[PDB]
């Protein structure tokens, strides 16, 4: 028997919505260690001989995400269900519901790791966005709130 | 003793160390003016009174300026980077001395520093240059 | 104690958030039912036996009163 705050997970986001979430999220990769290093050597070769705006990426640290929700800066928050200590993330759907930040439980922790240059991530969030994907993001917010939140209003109940 | 009996018996020898004279006559090491003016025949406290300098700052338990002037003798006797200087050249030639315009500027003053920061660095720039 | 331990809006938020998300412990699950049936008198008796001192049991039963009243109404 599962106490309602556990198994608020497993009632995860479905097939098509999850695919569309990654269609958005895979656009916003953090610049990998190799890519970042080569860019700075390009900067070294250029600026030593002879401007840029703030670049948007996903935010992916548990401490960073728990900061961003309640900041409030997070817009979408993805949460993996499979976590070795489950108690690490059990409060997080409740925190998002309380602060009114739209969240989604995604399926697979390594699935979050792929979009983020890590092995696993447990939580991923998209704070800010480029102007072109703004309408698409807000549409996905409504899509997730209709599919995830409104269908499973009774997820806080039932063992 | 068991082990000591062998060491006296063996043809290996003992690691003979004569280091009892050095435990008393310690050379001063940390000041050259003192290194010249320090009578080793005298003690620690007697050497301090001979110099002038205090050996103890508290009221001591029990009972009891040629050099100090030379210490007062030795008591009698930072730029900006290339990018920083060249960046300040860009600001000065653009605005002049309008620090309000200079910090509300976006293209040249990228890191949004205050009026006080920019003007201080310009004062240092105006010393090395015009 | 100049730095005694001021309210701190964040800490109050976290404590009350965890207070509901965790649920209720078995003695507290018994205790809240014991308030509604046997009154606040017998509730303080069981809480004093369960915990160490009575000074703990006062603030504990008082916390249960706040939880019950805020749940049913609002």
């Amino acid at each position: 028997k599962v106490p309602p705050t556990i198994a608020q997970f497993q009632y995860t986001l479905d097939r098509n919505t999850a695919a569309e979430t990654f269609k958005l999220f895979n656009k916003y990769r953090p610049e990998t260690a190799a890519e970042k290093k080569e860019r700075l050597t390009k900067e070294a070769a250029a600026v030593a001989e002879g401007a840029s705006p703030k670049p948007y990426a996903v935010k992916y640290g548990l401490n960073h995400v728990v900061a961003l929700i309640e900041n409030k800066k997070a817009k979408l928050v993805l949460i993996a269900n499979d976590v070795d200590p489950i108690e690490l993330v059990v409060f997080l759907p409740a925190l998002c519901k309380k602060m009114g930040v739209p969240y989604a439980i995604v399926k697979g922790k390594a699935r979050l790791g792929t979009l983020v240059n890590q092995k696993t991530s447990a939580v991923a969030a998209l704070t800010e966005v480029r102007a072109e994907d703004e309408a698409a993001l807000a549409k996905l917010v409504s899509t997730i709130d209709a599919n995830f939140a409104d269908k499973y209003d009774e997820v806080k109940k039932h063992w | 003793s068991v082990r000591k009996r062998k060491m006296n018996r063996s043809s290996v020898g003992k690691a003979t160390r004569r280091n009892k004279d050095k435990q008393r006559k310690i050379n001063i090491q940390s000041n050259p003016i003192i290194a010249a003016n320090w009578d080793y025949s005298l003690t620690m406290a007697q050497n301090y009174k001979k110099l002038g300098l205090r050996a103890k700052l508290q009221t001591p338990a029990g009972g009891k300026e040629t050099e100090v002037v030379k210490k007062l003798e030795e008591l009698a006797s930072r730029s900006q980077s290339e990018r920083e200087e060249e960046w300040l050249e860009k600001l000065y030639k653009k605005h002049g001395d309008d620090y309000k315009k200079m910090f509300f500027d976006k293209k040249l003053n990228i890191y949004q520093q205050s009026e006080g920061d920019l003007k201080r660095r310009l004062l240092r720039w105006k010393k090395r240059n015009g | 104690s100049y730095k005694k331990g001021a309210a701190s809006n964040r800490t109050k938020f976290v404590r009350s958030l965890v207070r509901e998300i965790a649920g209720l412990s078995p003695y507290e699950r018994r205790l809240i039912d014991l308030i509604r049936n046997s009154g606040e008198k017998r509730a303080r008796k069981v809480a004093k036996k369960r915990l160490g001192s009575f000074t703990r049991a006062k603030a504990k039963v008082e916390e249960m009163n706040n939880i019950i009243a805020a749940s049913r109404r609002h």
């Binding site: 703030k54 309640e70 900041n71 602060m99 | 990228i110 890191y111 520093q113 | -």
Partner: peptide, 26 residues
């Protein structure tokens, strides 16, 4: 029963100023 979270939050839980490091390029 999702009791406390039904009353949805308004100001963030802190009041910390956000530093100049989160504006001018890093």
């Amino acid at each position: 029963i999702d009791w406390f979270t039904r009353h949805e939050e308004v100001m963030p839980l802190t009041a910390v100023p956000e530093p100049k490091r989160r504006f001018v390029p890093s």
